[PDB]
């Protein structure tokens, strides 16, 4: 019930416009917007110490802010630029004699010229193994751009964080990306044919009228998964 921003993931062509909204019902005076990326660190863009009044941070240009109400402090990108590909964080400082600053879940957006570079991931489940000493099976998402994906495992219809490990960073095939995950279960658990495994990745993508990708299809926002069953062997 703290700071909540939107959307989580975004893609777009250059010279294009976007609005990021941030909401807090926490009843806080001060709201911030931060920009992050691997090499440039975490830096402030815009900030507001109250409703109706804003002011500039370290990187005020490329961005614009209008705050009508205390609860919401959004920001807008008038013209998209490759420099603006990044992870933004809405913050809330309240505050009364308080410097504590709370952040929203964060948002990730990317800017690409052609927009035909966008591809949905290809999911596969690989079922091991010979030499099961005690069973760890892996899932591969391959050839996806942009980098926005949510990967996870569903066993018998339920998501499990139990034995799951996923790569913190995706591999580069040269755009484009490949991610790998894995889970490890008891030897007898995998050997039960009644047990079902699904490796699912949610790919965020275009919404409407891009149009699509080179040689048709579309890279819309979708879910692609892979299926495996218990092997009696």
């Amino acid at each position: 019930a703290g700071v909540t921003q939107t959307p989580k993931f975004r893609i777009l062509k250059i010279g294009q416009s976007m609005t990021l909204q941030c909401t807090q019902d926490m009843n806080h005076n001060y709201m911030y917007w931060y920009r992050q990326d691997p090499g440039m660190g975490l830096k402030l863009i815009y900030y507001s110490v109250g409703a109706g009044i804003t002011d500039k941070g370290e990187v005020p240009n490329g961005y614009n802010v209008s705050r009508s109400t205390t609860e919401d402090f959004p920001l807008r990108l008038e013209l998209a630029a490759p420099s603006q590909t990044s992870v933004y964080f809405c913050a809330s400082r309240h505050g009364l004699a308080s410097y504590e600053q709370y952040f929203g879940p964060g948002t990730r957006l990317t800017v690409t010229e052609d927009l035909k570079n966008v591809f949905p991931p290809e999911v596969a489940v690989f079922e091991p193994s010979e030499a099961e000493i005690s069973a760890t099976l892996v899932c591969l998402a391959t050839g996806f751009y942009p980098d926005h994906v949510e990967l996870s495992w569903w066993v018998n219809g339920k998501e499990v964080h139990s034995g799951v490990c996923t790569d913190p960073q995706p591999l580069k095939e040269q755009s484009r990306y490949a991610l790998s995950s894995r889970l490890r279960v008891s030897a007898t658990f995998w050997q039960n044919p009644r047990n079902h495994f699904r490796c699912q990745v949610q790919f965020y993508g275009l919404s409407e009228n891009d149009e699509w990708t080179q040689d048709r299809a579309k890279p819309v926002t979708q879910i692609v998964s892979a299926e495996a069953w218990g092997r009696a062997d």
Binding site: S98, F126, R182
Partner: protein, 201 residues
């Protein structure tokens, strides 16, 4: 140069302790705000405002003294999930309020495996052209991992999983291609694995 943190990068085996030193400008100034960020929005840890101080919350302690620029930031029983970047932030005038973030301290803590049985296996898809994947697992967390040899093949880096039930915490990495000439032994020769490894044939 308002804030500088040390060490820049820290890598410890599980447990022990870590002391993170933070240096700031003395004119003017306000509370130091400790945050821990891992692959997501920063999480608020400590607020040092005006305090003496001897202060602790949970397994951590924020105690600061003057000592014009310092913070203790102790730790106890470092756990595998504590790997993250730590930021002492900043506060000061004029034009309140604001935060100045340092480069952050990247902290990595390896898990303890007792009886390693490292090995490399081979696995196949469900319905496919019989494309396959090789898996290196169960080794010790110190062992490095090499990137793609010819770059036309793909290899991940060290990643650890866990099971609350069986208490087992196991590392791993995967390497794969579509080629039929691809073979695990032949594949990972790039970096030498301990002889404790396994090559079923």
């Amino acid at each position: 140069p308002k804030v500088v943190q040390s060490p820049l990068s820290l890598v410890v085996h599980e447990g022990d302790t870590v002391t993170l030193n933070c240096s700031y400008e003395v004119t003017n100034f306000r509370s130091l705000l400790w945050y821990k960020q891992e692959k997501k929005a920063p999480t608020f840890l400590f607020m040092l405002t005006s305090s003496g101080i001897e202060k602790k919350s949970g397994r951590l302690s924020s105690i600061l003294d003057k000592k014009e620029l310092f913070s203790i930031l102790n730790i106890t029983a470092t756990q595998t999930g504590d790997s993250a970047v730590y930021l002492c932030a900043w506060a000061g005038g004029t034009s309140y309020g604001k935060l100045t973030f340092g480069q952050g301290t990247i902290l990595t803590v390896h898990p303890n495996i007792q009886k390693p049985d490292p090995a490399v296996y081979q696995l196949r898809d469900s319905k496919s052209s019989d494309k396959s994947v090789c898996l290196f697992t169960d080794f010790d967390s110190q062992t490095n991992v090499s990137q793609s040899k010819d770059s036309d093949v793909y290899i991940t880096d060290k990643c650890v999983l866990d099971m609350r039930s069986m208490d087992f915490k196991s590392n791993s990495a995967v390497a794969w291609s579509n080629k039929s000439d691809f073979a695990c032994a032949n594949a990972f020769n790039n970096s030498i694995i301990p002889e404790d490894t396994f090559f079923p044939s």
